[PDB]
């Protein structure tokens, strides 16, 4: 009875119409315009925008935004007079615990990814505060995304 019931419920036309759950890239963006970059950013240093959920990194004299959803995790190391921060970003291979249905990046075999950036600074205290604030911003983002999924 169940064999026939299943054969009736599922037709070969439904099999042809396969709603492949292509991973739905959750589209996020840090800024649309250069005028949205805060005036504070000017000391060629790491800065955090909690409003735009964005980490701004000093790459070769340019204020490069990275959205908190592209950020995976980081580490901090003290070495002589300098403090090092390594920031790791989401890439295939080094994947996060997210399911196959929703990727933090758009699907692409030809896409290359920034896997990690390592910075150094003479000021240890501020660099420790910046790392704490990045980690807190990630916790708040993950909590809001869980709350959304539960709702």
């Amino acid at each position: 009875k169940i064999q026939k019931e299943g054969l009736a419920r599922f037709n070969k036309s439904d099999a042809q119409d396969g709603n492949e759950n292509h991973a739905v890239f959750k589209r996020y963006e840090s800024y649309v315009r250069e005028s949205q970059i805060p005036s504070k950013v000017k000391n060629l240093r790491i800065s955090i925008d909690p409003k735009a959920q964005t980490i701004i990194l000093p790459i070769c004299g340019r204020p490069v935004p990275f959205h908190i959803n592209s950020f995976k995790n980081g580490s901090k190391n003290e070495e002589g007079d300098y403090m090092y921060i390594r920031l790791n970003f989401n890439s295939p291979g080094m994947g996060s615990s997210v399911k196959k249905t929703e990727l933090p990046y758009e699907d692409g075999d030809d896409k290359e990814f920034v896997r990690s950036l390592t910075f150094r600074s003479t000021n240890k205290e501020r660099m420790s505060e910046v790392f704490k604030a990045i980690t807190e911003l990630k916790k708040t983002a993950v909590k809001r995304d869980q709350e959304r999924k539960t709702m």
């Binding site: 790459i59 070769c60 004299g61 490069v64 990275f66 959205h67 290359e112």
Partner: protein, 429 residues
């Protein structure tokens, strides 16, 4: 002749502001005399003939003028206002016959894109817009750290007699992930364009060395200042200064010999770190090796430190001597400790990991992942506990305790007498 000048402009991320000037002879920049910059006060001058192209884009301190030279160098001038664009465009066009290009950058915050090796800079594009560019002159080294992973080290901006003090947080290392069967070709093309030192002459190479931490068949190429480990998936460059200690320890199987390198900073493979490199040799493995050195360089630098040729001796001895001569580190051999079985070490378990403990003259050393080095000067007390044909040793130090379990009870007295002889406080529950 209308000289156009801009005050408060910075050269290559300089801490001090300067005065920028455009002349028919070229570009000039001079630091403003108000800051005691231990440093030449000499004006930077770029001839008009060396200018190839000029781009205008958003920098940290306002707008940035990026000048591409015919000598594959990039000059960065930051601190311009948005109004300066019209004046700069007209003056650069009039003086050099070069178009000022406005380059918009990606602000999306995505870490994916396409890399593009341009003549003087590596460009990372996000949605057909540049997110960032790195001049090849800022890249110190590049190294494949994964079938799909490329690590670029950047020149540390410290103290050089020719560079202005930089202001801010400095980028030291960039790691890219290049999927597809593609990262090796990208690495080769980056090497050709960045013009890295070429015709390198390894002093000595050792092929097919089986490591244990991490396990792999690495080729070891030795140079004057650095050691290279080449592997099927990961290449490592270790500076000779970063080698802290060399251990040369016989395995208790009496068939193998361990050579162990302590490296600081510890080697990275993705997220895992290797502070100790553990190599495993056969004791019967013999190798003949001639050093690739000129007779003048050998006599001047390496006489009495290295042999010109090593005869057919055991590979681990030749390697240990070469490492001693190039790193100037002392090789630590087994100490005066002899087990009841006349062995140089004892079998034990550290947590779930089975291994061998060596009681060396200055330190206790465990040689199986994880590798544990304990200097006697850091040990507060050793407690022997009864689990029994076996007993356990808890070593207490200022940073915690390590329990070595499953040690044969016959080895208890030799270990206690040796540790008391080294001045370590032994407590017996």
């Amino acid at each position: 002749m209308s000289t156009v000048d801009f005050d408060t402009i910075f050269l290559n991320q300089s801490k001090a502001p300067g005065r920028f000037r455009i002349t028919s002879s070229g570009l000039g920049w001079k630091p403003s005399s108000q800051v005691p910059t231990k440093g030449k006060t000499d004006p930077f001058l770029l001839p008009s003939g060396d200018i190839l192209s000029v781009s205008w884009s958003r920098g940290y301190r306002g707008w940035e003028l990026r000048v591409y030279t015919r000598n594959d160098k990039v000059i960065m001038l930051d601190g311009f206002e948005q109004q300066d664009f019209q004046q700069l465009k007209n003056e650069i066009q009039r003086t050099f016959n070069v178009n000022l290009e406005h380059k918009e950058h990606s602000l999306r915050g995505w870490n994916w894109g396409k890399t593009q090796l341009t003549r003087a800079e590596l460009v990372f594009n996000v949605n057909n817009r540049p997110a960032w560019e790195i001049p090849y002159s800022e890249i110190s080294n590049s190294n494949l750290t994964g079938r799909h992973e490329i690590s670029m080290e950047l020149n540390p901006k410290t103290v050089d007699e020719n560079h202005y003090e930089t202001l801010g947080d400095e980028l030291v290392e960039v790691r890219l992930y290049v999927p597809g069967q593609k990262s090796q070709l990208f690495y080769e093309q980056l090497k050709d364009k960045a013009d890295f030192d070429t015709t390198s002459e390894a002093i000595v190479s050792f092929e097919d060395i089986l490591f244990l931490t991490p396990r792999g068949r690495f080729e070891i190429s030795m140079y004057a200042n650095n050691l290279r480990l080449r592997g099927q998936s990961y290449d490592y460059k270790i500076q000779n200064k970063n080698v802290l200690r060399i251990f040369s320890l016989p395995r208790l199987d009496d068939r193998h010999h361990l050579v162990i390198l302590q490296v600081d900073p510890p080697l990275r493979q993705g997220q895992t770190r290797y502070p100790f490199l553990v190599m495993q040799f056969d004791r019967n493995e013999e190798l003949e090796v001639e050093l690739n050195l000129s007779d003048e360089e050998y006599k001047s630098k390496y006489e009495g430190k290295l042999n010109r040729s090593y005869g057919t001796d055991s590979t681990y001895k030749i390697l240990s001597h070469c490492l001693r001569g190039l790193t100037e580190r002392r090789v630590i051999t087994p100490g005066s400790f002899q087990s009841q079985h006349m062995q140089p070490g004892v079998n034990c378990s550290l947590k779930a990991s089975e291994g061998q403990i060596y009681l060396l003259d200055k330190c206790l050393f465990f040689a199986t992942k994880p590798c544990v080095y304990l200097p006697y000067s850091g040990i507060i007390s050793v407690v022997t506990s009864r689990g029994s044909r076996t007993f356990d040793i808890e070593v207490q130090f200022s940073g915690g305790s390590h329990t070595f379990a499953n040690i044969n009870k016959d080895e208890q007295k030799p270990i206690e007498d040796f540790l008391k002889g080294q001045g370590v406080r032994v407590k017996n529950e």
